[PDB]
Point group: none
Chain length 68, copies 6
């Protein structure tokens, strides 16, 4: 087997973005393989894909991953 | 078997986005493989796929993954 | 097996971006390999993909990963 | 097996970007290899991808990684 | 096996960029190899990719890495 | 086996450069080698890729690395 865990505790801003382009296909996070036995795809934290996407102060949480 | 867990505890903003392209397709997070025996896709945290989607202050939780 | 974990605790700004370009495909973070036995894809913290994407004060959390 | 972890504790801006270029695809962080047995891909901290991306005071957390 | 970790504690501005150039593809940080057994990709701290990208006071956090 | 770690504590600006030149592809930090068994890619601190990119007072945290 394999193990992982996390927790959070706590005890105690303007931004301008105008987008402009005529074309672009976009992929966030990816991998590919033919003839491949153990394709394992793992993702955590904060992630998004968009022709525009913006990351103000985005992560206050915590985390981890493991495999194989 | 295989193991993970978490939970969250606690003891105690302007942004502009204008979209512009007419259409051009987007896929957020994915992976591909022909001829694959141990085909595993695993996902956590905060995720969306959309032509625009935005990540203001998004993650307060916690989490983790394992497989094989 | 493999093990990982993390936590957060706590005890105690203007920016201009105007985009302009005529075309661009964009991929955030990616890798590729044919004929691969142990294809492992892992990501943490904060990452986002867009023809524009901006990272004000983005990470207040903490984290780590391991595999194989 | 392999182990990693981290934590944050705490006890106690004017910038302009004008974008202008006519074309240029962008990729953030990436690597590639054919015939490759143990492709292992890992990332953390704060990283983002676009034709322009700006990193104001962006990292206030902590972390690390290990594999193989 | 292998180990890594880090932490942060704490106890206690104008700049101009106008971009102008006619074309440029840009890649943040990358490496490549055919015929490779132990392809390992690791990144930390703060890094971002753009045809223009600017780093005011970007790191207050801390970190390290190790592998294989 | 292998080990690494670090930490930070604490207890106790005008500049003009406007960009103009006609073309440039730019890569931040990279290396390549075919027929290479132990391709190991590790990076820290802050570095950013852009045809013009400016680093006022950018890294005030700390770190170091080793692998294999």
């Amino acid at each position: 087997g394999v193990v992982a865990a996390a927790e959070k505790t706590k005890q105690g801003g303007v931004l301008y973005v105008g987008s402009k382009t005529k074309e672009g296909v976009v992929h966030g996070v990816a991998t590919v393989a033919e003839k491949t036995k153990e394709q394992v795809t793992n993702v955590g934290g904060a992630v998004v894909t968009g022709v525009t996407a913006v990351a103000q102060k985005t992560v206050e949480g915590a985390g981890s991953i493991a495999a194989a």
